[PDB]
Write a protein that binds this ligand. Structure first.
Ligand SMILES: [Pb+2]
Length: 151
C-alpha cells in the first residue's frame, strides 16, 4: 500500500546556523478516512539522539490527497551540530475527534540513507541555497526504528 510522497526544500546558512525547511506539497497520499479522503497536515521534528529539540507544523488542508502548502519553517542549528541532527517530516491525517494518525514519515540528516541522504548532502554542499526534493513516505514504525541507527 503506497502511503504517498512529500516535496520539501532544505536550506542551510552556515554563518547563522539557520536551517530552513519549506513544506511544498504532497501527492498521492493514502486515503485515511472511511467514506472520504484525508485531511493532511505535516509535522517537522528536529531530533538529536532520541530527543526532540523543536517541533513545527503546517496548516491543515481538508479532503485532499494532493495538498499544496509552501509553508516555511526555520531552525537554529549551529554549524558544529548540523551533522548530528535529524529532520523528521511526518504527514498526518487530522481528525477533530481522537488522535491524529500518521500517513507516513521520512527523515533527512547524516544518519539517513539513499535519496534522503542525498537531499541532505546536496543541501550541505550548496550552502545558502534551497534544494527541493521529493521523498517517498515510509511507515512510521520503520522510520522510528532507523532513527536509532548511528553512522
Ligand atoms: Pb480525517
Amino acid at each position: 500500500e503506497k502511503l504517498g510522497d512529500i516535496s520539501f526544500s532544505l536550506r542551510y546558512v552556515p554563518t547563522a546556523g539557520k536551517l530552513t525547511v519549506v513544506i511544498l506539497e504532497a501527492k498521492n497520499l493514502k486515503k485515511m478516512d472511511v467514506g472520504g479522503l484525508s485531511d493532511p497536515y505535516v509535522k517537522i521534528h528536529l531530533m538529536q539522539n532520541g530527543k526532540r529539540l523543536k517541533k513545527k507544523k503546517t496548516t491543515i488542508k481538508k479532503n485532499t490527497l494532493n495538498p499544496y502548502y509552501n509553508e516555511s519553517f526555520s531552525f537554529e542549528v549551529p554549524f558544529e551540530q548540523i551533522q548530528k541532527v535529524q529532520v523528521v517530516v511526518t504527514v498526518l491525517d487530522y481528525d477533530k475527534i481522537g488522535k491524529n494518525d500518521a500517513i507516513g514519515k521520512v527523515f533527512v540528516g547524516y544518519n539517513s540513507t539513499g535519496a534522503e541522504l542525498r537531499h541532505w548532502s546536496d543541501m550541505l554542499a550548496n550552502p545558502r541555497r534551497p534544494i527541493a526534493q521529493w521523498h517517498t513516505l515510509q511507515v512510521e514504525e520503520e522510520v522510528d526504528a532507523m532513527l536509532a541507527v548511528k553512522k
